[PDB]
Each structure stands twice: as C-alpha cells, then as structure tokens.
Design a protein around this nucleic acid. Structure first.
Ligand code: 0XS
Ligand code: ZN
Length: 573
DNA sequence: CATTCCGATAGTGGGGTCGCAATTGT
DNA sequence: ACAATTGCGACCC
DNA sequence: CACTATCGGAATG
C-alpha cells in the first residue's frame, strides 16, 4: 500500500537522524539515507496529497549515494578541423544542424516528476552516477519546480553545470582573503563544488546551468525537433543558451564555429568547442550510438593553447599486456589552467618521429583542452648537453626480454606471469570501474598485495580478511573492513563485466559485451571453436584466436573456476 | 579478386577536488 | 584523548 | 579525459 510505503520510508529516515543526533556523529555515514530521501521524494510527488508537514522532505550531512540512468549519458566524438567536420557530415548523409556552445563544466542529469525536481546525478560510467541532488538544489538557475503546460509525468533534463569567470574569480578572492584553498580553473572548480558533502558550501559557489538534452521522458507533448524541445524547456523556466542556432548546411556550421571562436573572450564563461547535432529526433534514432558516443553529434574543438617546457627524463612504464609505454617527465609548466608535469610519448616510433632527446625543449598543449601531448621538439633551442632516449631491451621491472613483432609498433615485456608490473596492472584492471568495480582497491594497496605476495590471481582478492589487510602501509581497521565489504558486494557482476575483467587480449569492454550477448553463457563461450567465434559481429581471426587460446590453457580455466568458487556470479540469461 | 581505406575499439597515457580514514600533532 | 593534517582513491574533465 | 595502433569489414579499381 502507498500509506504503508510512505511510513516505512519516513521511519527509517527518522531512525537515521536519531542515530545521528545520539552519537553526535559528524554525518549520517550510510548511503541508504540519501537513497531513501530520493525514494520518498519520488513517492510523495507521485502522491502529493499524502505529504505530511513534518515529513523528512519538508525539513545532517550524509554520505553520497548513486543513481542509475536507464538512458545512458555518453560522450561526444571530437572533430578538430573543417575537413574532419566535412567527413562527419558525409558519414551522416551516407547512413538540419542544431549548433550549440560546448560549455566547459560537468554533465548533470536532473529528473523532474510531475514538474517537481526529484534527483540530480553526475555521468559516472554512463549507467550509474553519483547522487548530487542536495548540491544541485542550491543552484539558483535550476528551478525546484517547472511551470506551464504539458509538463511530462517524467522528464530528465540533461545539461552542463559550470562556474562563470566572475564567480570563479569571486571564490578565489574569498580563498585569498581567508587563507582558503585557491582553485586552478573554472572547469575543475565546478566539479569539486558539486561534490561537496555539505550543500551549504556548494551554495556559496555561483554555479549556473544550461540545458542541452533529455534523458527519460514519459508523457507531455514535446516536438520531434531538438531545438524545439530546448525552446519548450525555456517556456518551463529552465536556462537555455541564447546562442543555440539552426544551420542548414555544413558551410553555415563552419561560419558558426568561426563566429563562436571570435566571440570566445566575451562570453563570460569557458567553453571547449561547439557541439553540432542532427536536429531531428527521428534522424537521431536512425543514426544510433557507437559504444562510447552518438553518431549524430560531434564536438567541434578549437585549437589547443601551446606552451614550452623541457623534458627532464623519459621513463618506460609496463602495462598489463606487457606493453612498454614511454612517458616524458617535463619541467612543470602551466597550460590552460592546470600544471603539466608529464605526457605520454606513445612508442619508440613516435620518439623517433619527434627526434626527442632528454634535455630537449618541447612545445606542449592540452590535447582537446584536456590531456598533455608533446607536439614537437624545438631543435634550435636544443642544449649542448642532451641524452639519447634508449628504449628498454629488458623489462625495467622484472628483467625479461622485450620483444617487438615485425611491422608492429608496441614492444612488450615477455615475462608474462613472472612480471610484477604485469601482475599489478592486471589486478588494477580486474578491479576497475567498468570491470569488477571494487571501491578502494587502488595502485598502492595493489602494489603491496603483490609485493608482499599475498595475491597471485584474482580469486585471491576474495580470500583476504580484514586482519590480513589492517597490517598494510596506510591501511587500518576501518579501511580494511571497507575493502572486505567492497570485495563482497562486487561478487554480483554481469557476464560482460566478468569477461572484460579477465583481460583477454583484444577483448575489451565492447567486445566483451559482444561475446556475452552472442554466447549467452560461459560454457557456450568456452566450447566455441575459432570458427563459431568468427560469427560474432566484429570478431575476426585475431579476436577469435585470443579468445580460443585463452580458454584453452588450464591455468586460465582455473583462475575462473576459482573466482566462481569464491562466489562471483551473474544472472542466468 | 587484391588492395587500400575507414569506422570503431583496445590499451595505453594526465590533472584537479574532495571524502574518508591513517597518521602526525597538541 | 581528540584535533589537525594528509595519503589514497573515487570521480570530474 | 585524448591519442592512435590495431582490428574487422567496407570501399576501391
Ligand atoms: N558540454 C556541452 O555543453 C554539451 C554537451 C553535450 C553532451 C552530449 Br552526450 C550531447 C548529446 F547531444 F549527445 F546529448 N550534447 C551536448 N550538448 C552540449 N551543448
Ligand atoms: Zn616485466
């Protein structure tokens, strides 16, 4: 019953608050609480007459919980120049543009139920995000209540939370006065603001919001035009950029891009491109989505700001597949709002292309306004003393022979199971967000688990007890029990995540999804010949043979039978 | 047909902010 | 002792 | 978050 449903929710919420007052605790540390507050708002908005004056929603810091988005929040593929846009355009035609500023903030999804704001979440991994409702409620530009006609029963508004330049500078002024923490740039400051435990701190940071999209939608009368939906949003009280434009050709899109580039300094806030999307919702549904991103939109980026620094060293790091990746250690320099000290160098071939020597002066940028990249050596400034970058012929960790197969770029450690670096990075991978998802298990504790020889394969993680853990460096009684707990909860996975977690060569997230959908179960998968494997969409000789060799080797079957015995499971399909 | 091209994925890599709890300090 | 500082890892881009 | 070497399969002559 719904009367029964409300009291049950209200009673546990007031239990939590009473436990909190009585322990004079610094916060309700249980994620249950923010979740139950969400469940109770939903139910109460759904039955507005049954709301009581002293209901917990009518009003204690609480730990952040999570929100699943049935409609994924994905990424945008990038284009960096006019010719790449044209190739985007042709790809669309071959399978009207609404043109928008790409606000530099973070993505937030806000669920209104019957027009009443009920939750807000971050993107997370696309499916599951952080519940940040309490922080979002504080944002002046986001209404608690929609107003107007044909408001849908359920409307999930997607948008960008950002901090304008005057608000960023305001907060840094406050920090400088009161000896507080000074922020590096508006993008990373906006993300931080939204993750405060304490909504009252978020409230003093002048975050604003612009809508760009819809998630779930049930009821209402929205048009089939995306701009049309953005104008409806605005009729309902939601903030929408004054700059959303319709373009009828690729040439008009290019003029929009150049005009926004020219006007960038006058906007009052930061942006990192424009977003170009298929305006028609029915043309968007026909174009669909790749694993990572829609086929009907790109981000068209502006050129990234460059700076000069010099390379102090080049180190070679060992990956889980044995890959040896060079990394430049740079003299720290500021670039577009952040301190850059490192950049990948990809491979031996790239180093040769740059003709990079240790000591060289280099041009550096944040690729796509994010990730350090080395552009080129400045040869005319090369110092009298520089040193040759020698690629490792022996694994810097375990000592084994490095092998590079004829005509391929990547050089590997041949140590396999004896390599500690490989051991460590296979576990970091096993445990990662998109695989087994074990909270708390990062590089340091994995580094010790392996160094101390406590874990040899993944099933060993499930045997660790809190006592075994407490004794480690930077571990203790509470963090030990948190890890045993996380490991317990992570046993319930999915067939795809499990396949992904094993680190079969060439089998990453999308290919694991693929084998899982096709084979249904692990025994089918295990019994496949190289030939039935090649039937799976996007599985070819190379993937077939890795999948086959892997399941063929008893060690690998035992890893799995062991993880199965430690209690790892997923739903029968 | 062999060959080249291209869409998409796998497997690497970066910096900032902040919560929790280990540790240091008082 | 408990209070301040800070290592680590989650999570934003 | 990006780069891009690679894979698998579609386009070319
Ligand atoms: N950062 C931005 O301002 C922005 C981000 C978007 C992300 C996605 Br995913 C989309 C999609 F169209 F795919 F939903 N649109 C967007 N539009 C925008 N203006
Ligand atoms: Zn090695």
């Amino acid at each position: 019953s719904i009367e029964q449903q409300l009291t049950e929710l209200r009673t546990t919420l007031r239990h939590h608050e009473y436990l909190y007052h009585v322990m004079d605790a610094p916060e309700i540390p249980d994620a249950e609480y923010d979740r139950l507050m969400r469940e109770l708002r939903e139910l109460e908005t759904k039955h507005p007459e049954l709301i009581t004056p002293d209901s917990p929603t009518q009003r204690p810091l609480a730990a952040f919980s999570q929100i699943r988005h049935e409609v994924p929040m994905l990424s945008l593929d990038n284009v960096f120049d006019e010719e790449s846009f044209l190739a985007f355009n042709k790809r669309v035609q071959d399978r009207t543009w609404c043109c928008e500023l790409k606000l530099d903030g973070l993505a937030v999804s806000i669920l209104y139920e019957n027009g009443v704001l009920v939750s807000a979440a971050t993107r997370g991994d696309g499916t599951t995000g952080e519940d940040i409702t309490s922080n979002v409620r504080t944002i002046r530009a986001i209404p608690l209540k929609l107003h107007g006609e044909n408001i849908p029963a359920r409307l999930e508004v997607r948008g960008e939370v950002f901090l304008p330049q005057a608000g960023f500078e305001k907060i840094n002024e406050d920090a400088r006065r009161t000896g507080g923490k000074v922020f590096a740039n508006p993008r990373n400051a906006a993300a931080g603001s939204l993750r405060q435990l304490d909504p009252r701190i978020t409230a003093k940071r002048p975050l604003t919001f612009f809508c760009y999209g819809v998630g779930v939608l049930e009821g209402g009368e929205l048009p089939d035009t995306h701009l049309g939906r953005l104008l409806q949003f605005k009729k309902w009280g939601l903030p929408v950029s004054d700059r959303v434009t319709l373009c009828e050709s690729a040439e008009e899109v290019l003029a929009f891009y150049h005009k926004v580039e020219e006007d960038r300094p006058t906007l009052g806030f930061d942006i990192d491109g424009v977003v170009i999307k298929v305006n028609s919702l029915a043309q968007q549904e026909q174009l669909g989505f790749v694993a990572r991103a829609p086929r009907w939109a790109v981000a068209f980026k502006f050129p990234a700001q460059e700076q000069m620094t010099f390379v102090r060293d080049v180190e070679f790091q060992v990956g889980r597949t044995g890959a040896i990746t060079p990394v430049a250690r740079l003299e720290p320099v500021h670039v577009a709002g952040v301190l850059v000290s490192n950049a990948t160098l990809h491979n031996a071939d790239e180093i040769e292309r740059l003709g990079l020597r240790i000591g060289d002066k280099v041009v550096i940028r944040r690729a796509g306004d994010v990730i350090p990249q080395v552009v080129n050596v400045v040869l005319s400034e090369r110092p009298e003393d520089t040193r040759e970058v020698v690629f490792p012929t022996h694994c810097p960790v375990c000592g084994s022979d490095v092998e590079r197969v004829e005509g391929e770029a990547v050089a590997r450690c041949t140590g396999g199971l004896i390599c500690g670096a490989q051991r460590k990075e296979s576990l970091k991978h096993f445990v990662s967000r998109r695989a087994m998802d074990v909270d708390g298990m990062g590089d340091k504790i994995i580094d010790q688990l392996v160094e101390k020889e406590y874990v040899h394969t993944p099933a060993d993680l499930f045997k660790l007890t809190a006592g075994k853990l407490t004794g480690l460096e930077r571990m203790g009684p509470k963090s030990a029990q948190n890890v045993v707990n996380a490991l317990e909860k992570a046993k319930e996975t999915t067939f795809a995540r499990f396949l992904y977690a094993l680190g079969i060569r060439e089998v990453g997230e999308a290919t694991a999804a693929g084998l899982a959908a096709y084979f249904g179960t692990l025994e089918a998968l295990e019994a496949a010949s190289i030939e039935e494997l090649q039937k799976v969409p996007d599985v070819g000789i190379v993937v077939a043979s890795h999948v086959h060799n892997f399941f063929a080797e008893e060690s690998n079957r035992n890893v799995i039978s062991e993880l199965l015995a430690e209690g790892v499971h997923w739903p029968a399909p």
